[PDB]
Design a protein around this nucleic acid. Structure first.
Ligand SMILES: [Ca+2]
Ligand SMILES: [Ca+2]
Length: 460
RNA sequence: AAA
């Protein structure tokens, strides 16, 4: 069992516990292909090795070898024929591939190549190479393979920065990881911008990286500094580096600023390049949603004639794009939520219900998203289905997810309003009395709360 | 990637 034990010591995709879910594999493959074609970075070894690992997981071992060979061919050019330690990721993935294919003599050849380099560099381990380049490669792999991996990704880049605080590559990976982790918490009470300083430093150290600049812009916009952010949007848009990705985030920036037409123009250009992007399809849908709201506001909710034809175009176009996003990535929870909400605007309550029911069964990486799912389903039950019983159930389920947030507070307020309404129609509704006590208790008004709980008890 |  010497071979297998040696393979487990290698640092490469096979030993990084990426845990790629089958339902996310088609989207991952498309994102990997998009990145190969459109992300401008110095070394593309990592991304080709991830494509090989994906092909392996698909049962296409011969196709996987092709991607590992391409990774070696490209390394020759990106380092000018010179030796580079990132090759050890490729060689580790060859050893695993050949082991899985039964080409065991070749698997041993690649273990020997790795060992030879670990010796040459005075690495303490025989097969496990300890160098910052490989910590970064582990981090980028994790960062590409979904939100559940982002704490691990950040820690890979942080390990490099603890020894070399001005390392450009790990500064970039740390900042992007941190930005996405901040995104997960953006609606939680008293959230803080942990990623802002990392992004400033990553831009300083990677001055040609437009991708990092547009994330810095968006975090500045989050923090109420939109004009400073817009300067970075403009600098990124003047750069060709990773242009199509720059367009995605500039489009988000302009939509949030209120320039929805500008956002749509950028997204339509980006969709020409990466038409399978679920991020693009969701962003385009949000733009049509924003335009729908603008039409509603100008016509006081009663568009007619051409304005009605325009509203319906916005609704149907948003449904098309949200449906496109969730076809491609069925685990994209918030896109299903936007879709359910847009089916309410289209007057299709059965399709809204269907998507809410799907959402109730999901297990988001971001557990607080289920507050939003219950809250919006509760509102649908209250206002479209005229079911106070089911509205109460789902406002309570939102509240029971204790994390303080904008939506938990809205759920408390919505439950309060519903119960106050019921009590006007029937002041001796014991259930409503107790719920109103519960609401006051959650608000901290302990005397009002016990008053209502007591009143409810007396009746019974 | 909603918020
Ligand atoms: Ca390019
Ligand atoms: Ca190729």
């Amino acid at each position: 069992h010497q071979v297998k034990d040696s393979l487990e010591q290698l640092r490469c995709h096979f030993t990084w516990e990426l845990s790629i879910d089958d339902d996310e594999m088609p989207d991952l493959e498309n994102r990997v292909l998009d990145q190969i074609e459109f992300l401008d970075t110095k070394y593309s070894v990592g991304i080709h090795n991830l494509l090989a690992y994906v092909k392996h997981l698909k049962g296409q071992n011969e196709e996987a070898l092709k991607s590992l060979k391409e990774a070696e061919n490209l390394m020759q050019e990106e380092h000018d024929n010179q030796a580079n330690v990132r090759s050890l990721v490729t060689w580790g993935n060859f050893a695993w591939m050949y082991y899985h294919m039964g080409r065991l003599a070749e698997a041993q050849t690649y273990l020997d190549k790795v060992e030879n380099i670990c010796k040459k560099l005075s690495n303490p381990f025989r097969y496990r190479m300890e160098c910052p380049e490989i910590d970064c490669e582990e981090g980028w792999a994790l960062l590409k393979c979904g939100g559940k991996n982002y704490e691990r990704a950040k820690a890979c880049f942080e390990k490099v920065l603890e020894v070399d605080p001005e390392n450009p590559e790990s500064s970039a990976g740390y900042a992007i990881s941190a930005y996405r982790l901040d995104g997960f918490k953006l609606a939680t009470k008293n959230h803080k911008p942990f990623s802002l300083l990392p992004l400033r430093q990553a831009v300083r150290l990677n001055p040609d990286n437009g991708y990092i600049k547009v994330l810095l812009a968006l975090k500045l916009q989050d923090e109420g500094q939109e004009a400073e952010g817009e300067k970075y949007i403009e600098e990124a848009l003047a750069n060709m580096s990773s242009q199509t990705y720059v367009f995605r985030y500039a489009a988000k920036f302009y939509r949030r600023k209120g320039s929805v037409d500008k956002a749509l123009e950028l997204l339509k250009k980006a969709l020409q390049e990466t038409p399978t992007s679920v991020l693009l399809h969701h962003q385009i849908g949000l733009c049509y949603k924003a335009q729908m709201i603008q039409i509603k506001e100008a016509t006081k909710g009663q568009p007619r004639g051409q304005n009605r034809e325009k509203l319906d175009k916005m609704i149907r176009s948003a449904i098309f794009h949200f449906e496109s996003a969730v076809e491609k990535k069925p685990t994209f929870e918030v896109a299903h939520l936007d879709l359910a909400r847009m089916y309410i605007e289209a007057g299709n309550h059965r399709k809204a219900e269907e998507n809410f029911q799907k959402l109730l069964c999901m297990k988001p990486v971001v557990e607080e998203t289920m507050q939003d799912i219950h809250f919006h389903y509760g509102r649908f039950q209250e206002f479209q289905k005229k079911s106070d019983v089911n509205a109460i159930i789902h406002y309570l389920k939102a509240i029971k997810i204790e994390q303080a947030s904008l939506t938990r507070d809205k759920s408390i307020n919505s439950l309060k309003k519903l119960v106050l309404r019921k009590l006007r129609r029937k002041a001796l509704d014991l259930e409503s009395l107790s719920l109103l006590g519960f609401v006051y208790k959650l608000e901290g008004n302990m005397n009002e709360a016990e008053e209502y709980y007591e009143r409810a008890e007396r009746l019974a």
